[PDB]
Amino acid sequence: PHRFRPGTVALREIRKYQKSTELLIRKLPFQRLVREIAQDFKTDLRFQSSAVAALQEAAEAYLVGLFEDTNLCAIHAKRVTIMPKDIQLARRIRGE
Amino acid sequence: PHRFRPGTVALREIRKYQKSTELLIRKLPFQRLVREIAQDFKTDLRFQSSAVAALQEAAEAYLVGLFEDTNLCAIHAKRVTIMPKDIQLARRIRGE
Amino acid sequence: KNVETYKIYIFKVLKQVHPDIGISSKAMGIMNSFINDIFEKLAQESSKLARYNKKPTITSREIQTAVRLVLPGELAKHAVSEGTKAVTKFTSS
Amino acid sequence: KNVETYKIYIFKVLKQVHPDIGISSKAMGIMNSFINDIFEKLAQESSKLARYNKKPTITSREIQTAVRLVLPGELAKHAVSEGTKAVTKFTSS
Amino acid sequence: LRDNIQGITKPAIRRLARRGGVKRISGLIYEETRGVLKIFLENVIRDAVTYTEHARRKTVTAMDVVYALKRQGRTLYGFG
Amino acid sequence: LRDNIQGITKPAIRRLARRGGVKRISGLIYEETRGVLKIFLENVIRDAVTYTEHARRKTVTAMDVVYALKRQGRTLYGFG
Amino acid sequence: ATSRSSKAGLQFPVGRIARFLKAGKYAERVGAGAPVYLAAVLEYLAAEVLELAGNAARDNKKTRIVPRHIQLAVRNDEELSKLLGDVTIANGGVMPNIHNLLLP
Amino acid sequence: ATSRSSKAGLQFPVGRIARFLKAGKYAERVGAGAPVYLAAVLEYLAAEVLELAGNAARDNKKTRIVPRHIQLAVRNDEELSKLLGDVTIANGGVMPNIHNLLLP
DNA sequence: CCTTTATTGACTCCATAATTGACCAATTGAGCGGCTCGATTCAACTGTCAATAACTTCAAATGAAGCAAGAGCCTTATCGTATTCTCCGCACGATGGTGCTTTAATCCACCGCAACTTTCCTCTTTAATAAAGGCACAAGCATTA
DNA sequence: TAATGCTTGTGCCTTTATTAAAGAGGAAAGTTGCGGTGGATTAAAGCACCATCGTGCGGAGAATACGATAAGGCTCTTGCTTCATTTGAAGTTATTGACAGTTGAATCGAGCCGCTCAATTGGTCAATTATGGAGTCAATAAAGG
């Protein structure tokens, strides 16, 4: 059985997912999450579909940017695996 | 001759300079620098004294914040010495 | 010309809160600038709120929503409570 | 209600720049949002400029200063050049 | 309608990281990312719900979300 | 006026770093800090000079600097 | 000629704030209740900041509020620090903070 | 009835922009030359962005501009990227960038 | 280098939907006019920014000595990765109900404009005391033993 | 621990200049009055938002073998800190002068507000073409030999 050495498939996925414009998070779970979060602010809320779509786009873009910053932080410390401390440092410097 | 081991005087200076509200950069060199920089935008400019004072306050506060971020970046990489790469990373994450 | 500032009112509030504590001129100016900044923030936010809903009037409702959107958390809740109390007292007299 | 947009003018500019290239509706909407954002930025900045100097009017000078303050570098220089050319053309005929 | 934060599966986080250029991912990144995403959504949805409530509406529209995002310096085109 | 950027002496940078909590400093930090300070001053002074030029003045006032700072999200208190 | 400030039981200038709202051209019309609400909100914020500043002055063993105490009060409260994250106080100094890994 | 757009030699709606400026209550009065200047600036910015987007579309062997091309044009030019740094563009994707230290 | 194999770009053909085009109306830019104000130019005053000189003295520049911290290298073990199997619940298509968003019409009430009063706040002047500065002194930390 | 340098924290007198206090008057807040324009209320339609149902299939959860990456430990050498000497430039003070910011008027240009109109553009329906989807081939790169 031909097995790829670890790390090359990750590189192929990096190349492939950076080329596409598709949304990566499944739509229905994200919609349920948004509704649950909004339930704590005001009960009996209806969501226009475009509102949930905009929320998903914004959340995915924010997460991609955060992961780019996290990768920079991880590379700075002479590593290739991102860790929770990298995310914490990135969010700390960004002022979040 | 009694000599302090390296690092203790640095810690004392850290404790002392964080307690004070004084400006650390000398006024006249900073004023000359500001005039030199402004000469490139418009010739024959006069500066109100409070304008130069505000510029000095803003620059010193910005540098202090940048050095705090640089110290966080240096500590992240398991060091106590701040390096140019730390400043570069901090400014990169801040979006500058 | 006469320069208009909130120094008198801020001093009155200080005497109401800390009877025996005084305030320097620099701190007075800083507090005045802080209050001006907050006033401007709330005013522009309420103006945007009025513009979005096509209403030509700014009312206490726009100010309340501006307070909720600008101030964070417990601070916003307490500010809303104080504003509602003041408006109720003004209207009921 | 009739929704007002810059689709026609953006399409004319596109045909002037790229005669054989078309544009999708999504890209057209994105360009429309971009132009609306820039318009709002310049308008509020010019309003602040007029407020600072206590002038009740907005003229081409306020727009020029807003352009030089908001847009960066060579982009602002070229925008100023184009605006001045347009104003001269409007005034001279 | 609760615990839908676990609906953001591990492959989704891996795909988002891959899109960001990440080559290897630790084990606690999934929990950390879920927490930060929940915080971001809480802020944006709070602002959007306030905007919706002011207009005396019951349905959250896309314009409310766009305004809430623009309030935080994250202007989004394509939903105007 | 030339090379006045060297007027920001090494002890001044050391004091600014100490105020920031830095314990040890490298040798190239001084040049890096001088460069970043020059960039920051260039931006702020450019905005202040534009504000001054609009008002048809020749003297840069403190209010122009305050407005230039507020344009970049760094509002400064005590100079109003 | 009863003032609106004492009519609503406030210390802040309801009339002056109403005039400011009118002059700012934020809208064509300004409701009667808007300046009272805005004055109350500003009064509450000023009272909160001044209370924290006086507390900081007391714990320092001074009887006068200075910009250092305002900076300390702002940076010691989470809500104000969120509201005033980008704000620089002239002569405010910094909060004394030394990282654990730097200690001897 | 000569339109002000072609009177000034522009493509953008000088009249519509003038009406927008007057309606927005940015000031009590707007000069006759202000909308022409604003229209020219907006036209220049739109032309620049559209030219870069069309170049990006052509480089990809496509005929119609899509949001991906707009995102690529924005992020490949320093000036617009500085102007549009905080902007999220729907369906724009990201610029392909892999760190040299990750390569095999 | 080489060979096999998994992966993807290209190439072609068909579907499809969606972007371009034509048309009716609708509402809004343009023209003319009257009219009040505002922003331009001029003038004087007056506030202060720049340039000068002088002296002091403390902070910056430089050199030595030394030590401890960053970096390189080796070893390990454990933990993320790739591959396979099973399954499960998301996506798509249809439906049916209803509620809530938007629009139109009406009424009423409330805020802008104006003039007059009046009384409250703001520069100018006066003072009094809180804290910086200086001087003497105690005290906990650092350091080498 | 422990003695000693040693820098910093602490207690007390001085003054000063920085803040607390009083007044003239003028500049802005309150009041009355009017009225039309905006906001609150109500009825109605229509679409949009939700809840239900079926299926079926690609993507998610769970093991399993494993190898390579993060982490720990040792060594060294070199870069940075601490101390001391010399100096040179910033800080403070007093002075002068002229440039430029500001306030006050006259005023002539110009932009706001009405009324008409009609022409440009936006909602609605038709479409064919550029792109999406499926299937096949060739080119690319990776891994064990």
Coordinates of N, CA and C (backbone and C1' of nucleotides) in Angstrom, one line a residue, chain J residues 49-80:
Chain J
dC49 P -37.3 36.5 5.3 O5' -37.3 35.7 6.7 C5' -38.3 36.0 7.7 C4' -38.9 34.7 8.1 C3' -37.9 33.5 8.3 O3' -37.8 33.2 9.7 C1' -40.0 32.9 7.4
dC50 P -36.9 31.8 10.2 O5' -38.1 30.7 10.5 C5' -39.2 31.1 11.2 C4' -40.2 29.9 11.3 C3' -39.5 28.6 11.7 O3' -40.3 27.9 12.6 C1' -40.7 28.4 9.7
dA51 P -39.6 26.9 13.7 O5' -40.5 25.6 13.6 C5' -41.9 25.6 13.5 C4' -42.5 24.5 12.7 C3' -41.7 23.2 12.8 O3' -42.6 22.1 13.2 C1' -42.1 23.7 10.5
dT52 P -42.1 20.6 13.4 O5' -42.5 19.9 12.0 C5' -43.8 20.0 11.5 C4' -44.0 19.2 10.3 C3' -43.2 17.9 10.3 O3' -44.1 16.8 10.1 C1' -42.8 19.1 8.3
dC53 P -43.6 15.3 10.2 O5' -43.1 14.9 8.7 C5' -44.0 15.1 7.6 C4' -43.4 14.5 6.4 C3' -42.3 13.4 6.6 O3' -42.6 12.4 5.7 C1' -41.4 15.1 5.2
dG54 P -42.0 10.9 6.0 O5' -41.2 10.5 4.7 C5' -41.7 10.8 3.4 C4' -40.6 10.8 2.3 C3' -39.5 9.8 2.6 O3' -39.1 9.2 1.4 C1' -38.6 12.0 2.3
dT55 P -38.5 7.7 1.4 O5' -37.0 8.0 0.8 C5' -36.9 8.7 -0.5 C4' -35.4 9.0 -0.7 C3' -34.4 8.0 -0.2 O3' -33.3 8.0 -1.1 C1' -34.0 10.1 0.7
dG56 P -33.3 7.1 -2.4 O5' -31.9 7.6 -3.1 C5' -31.5 8.9 -3.1 C4' -30.1 9.1 -2.5 C3' -29.5 7.8 -2.1 O3' -28.1 7.8 -2.4 C1' -29.5 9.2 -0.3
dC57 P -27.5 8.3 -3.8 O5' -27.3 9.9 -3.6 C5' -26.0 10.5 -3.9 C4' -25.3 10.6 -2.6 C3' -24.0 9.8 -2.5 O3' -22.9 10.7 -2.4 C1' -25.2 9.8 -0.4
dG58 P -21.7 10.7 -3.4 O5' -20.7 11.8 -2.9 C5' -21.2 13.2 -2.8 C4' -21.0 13.7 -1.4 C3' -19.5 13.7 -0.9 O3' -19.4 14.8 0.0 C1' -20.8 12.3 0.6
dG59 P -17.9 15.5 0.1 O5' -17.8 15.9 1.6 C5' -18.9 16.5 2.3 C4' -19.1 15.9 3.7 C3' -17.8 16.0 4.6 O3' -18.2 16.5 5.9 C1' -18.6 13.8 4.6
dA60 P -17.1 17.1 6.8 O5' -17.3 16.3 8.2 C5' -18.5 16.3 8.9 C4' -18.7 15.1 9.8 C3' -17.5 15.0 10.8 O3' -18.1 14.7 12.1 C1' -17.8 13.0 9.6
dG61 P -17.2 14.8 13.4 O5' -17.1 13.4 14.0 C5' -18.3 12.7 14.4 C4' -18.0 11.2 14.7 C3' -16.8 11.0 15.7 O3' -17.1 10.0 16.6 C1' -16.4 9.8 13.7
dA62 P -16.1 9.6 17.8 O5' -15.3 8.3 17.3 C5' -16.1 7.3 16.7 C4' -15.2 6.0 16.5 C3' -14.0 6.0 17.4 O3' -13.7 4.6 17.8 C1' -13.3 6.0 15.2
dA63 P -12.9 4.3 19.1 O5' -11.8 3.2 18.6 C5' -11.0 3.6 17.5 C4' -10.7 2.3 16.7 C3' -9.3 1.7 17.0 O3' -9.2 0.4 16.6 C1' -9.3 2.9 14.9
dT64 P -8.0 -0.5 17.0 O5' -6.8 -0.1 15.9 C5' -7.1 -0.3 14.6 C4' -5.8 -0.2 13.8 C3' -4.5 -0.3 14.6 O3' -3.5 -0.9 13.8 C1' -4.5 1.8 13.6
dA65 P -2.2 -1.7 14.4 O5' -1.0 -1.1 13.6 C5' -1.1 -1.2 12.1 C4' -0.1 -0.2 11.5 C3' 1.3 -0.2 12.1 O3' 2.3 0.0 11.1 C1' 0.4 2.0 12.2
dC66 P 3.8 0.0 11.4 O5' 4.1 1.6 11.6 C5' 3.7 2.5 10.5 C4' 4.3 3.9 10.8 C3' 5.6 3.9 11.5 O3' 6.5 4.9 11.0 C1' 4.1 5.2 12.6
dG67 P 7.6 4.5 9.9 O5' 8.2 5.9 9.4 C5' 7.2 6.9 9.0 C4' 7.4 8.2 9.7 C3' 8.9 8.5 10.1 O3' 9.0 9.9 10.0 C1' 7.6 8.5 12.0
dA68 P 9.4 10.7 8.7 O5' 9.2 12.3 9.1 C5' 8.0 12.7 9.5 C4' 8.2 13.6 10.8 C3' 9.5 14.3 10.9 O3' 9.3 15.6 11.5 C1' 9.2 13.0 12.8
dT69 P 9.1 16.9 10.6 O5' 8.4 17.9 11.6 C5' 7.1 17.6 12.2 C4' 7.1 17.7 13.7 C3' 8.0 18.9 14.2 O3' 7.2 19.6 15.2 C1' 8.6 16.9 15.3
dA70 P 7.6 21.1 15.5 O5' 7.5 21.1 17.1 C5' 6.3 20.7 17.7 C4' 6.5 20.2 19.2 C3' 7.2 21.2 20.1 O3' 6.7 21.1 21.4 C1' 8.5 19.2 19.9
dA71 P 7.0 22.2 22.5 O5' 7.9 21.5 23.6 C5' 7.5 20.1 23.9 C4' 8.7 19.5 24.7 C3' 9.5 20.5 25.5 O3' 9.7 19.9 26.8 C1' 10.9 19.2 24.1
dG72 P 10.3 20.8 28.0 O5' 11.5 20.0 28.6 C5' 11.4 18.6 28.7 C4' 12.8 18.0 28.7 C3' 13.9 18.8 29.5 O3' 14.6 17.9 30.3 C1' 14.7 18.4 27.3
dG73 P 15.5 18.5 31.5 O5' 17.0 18.3 31.1 C5' 17.4 17.0 30.6 C4' 18.8 17.1 30.1 C3' 19.7 18.1 30.8 O3' 21.0 17.5 31.0 C1' 19.7 18.6 28.5
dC74 P 22.1 18.3 31.9 O5' 23.3 18.6 30.8 C5' 23.7 17.6 29.9 C4' 24.8 18.0 29.0 C3' 25.8 19.0 29.6 O3' 27.0 18.8 29.0 C1' 24.7 20.0 27.7
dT75 P 28.3 19.5 29.7 O5' 28.9 20.4 28.5 C5' 28.9 20.0 27.2 C4' 29.3 21.1 26.2 C3' 30.2 22.2 26.8 O3' 31.1 22.6 25.8 C1' 28.2 23.2 26.1
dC76 P 32.5 23.3 26.2 O5' 32.6 24.6 25.2 C5' 31.9 24.5 24.0 C4' 31.6 25.9 23.4 C3' 32.5 27.0 24.0 O3' 32.7 28.0 23.0 C1' 30.3 27.5 24.5
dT77 P 34.0 28.1 22.1 O5' 33.7 29.4 21.2 C5' 32.4 29.5 20.6 C4' 31.8 30.8 21.0 C3' 32.8 32.0 21.4 O3' 32.3 33.2 20.9 C1' 31.2 31.7 23.1
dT78 P 32.6 33.7 19.4 O5' 31.5 34.7 19.0 C5' 30.1 34.3 19.3 C4' 29.4 35.3 20.2 C3' 30.0 36.7 20.1 O3' 29.0 37.7 20.2 C1' 29.9 36.0 22.3
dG79 P 28.5 38.5 18.8 O5' 27.2 39.3 19.3 C5' 26.1 38.6 19.8 C4' 25.7 39.1 21.2 C3' 25.6 40.6 21.3 O3' 24.5 41.0 22.0 C1' 27.0 39.9 23.0
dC80 P 23.6 42.3 21.7 O5' 23.2 42.8 23.2 C5' 22.6 41.9 24.1 C4' 23.1 42.1 25.5 C3' 23.0 43.6 25.9 O3' 22.3 43.6 27.2 C1' 25.1 42.7 26.4

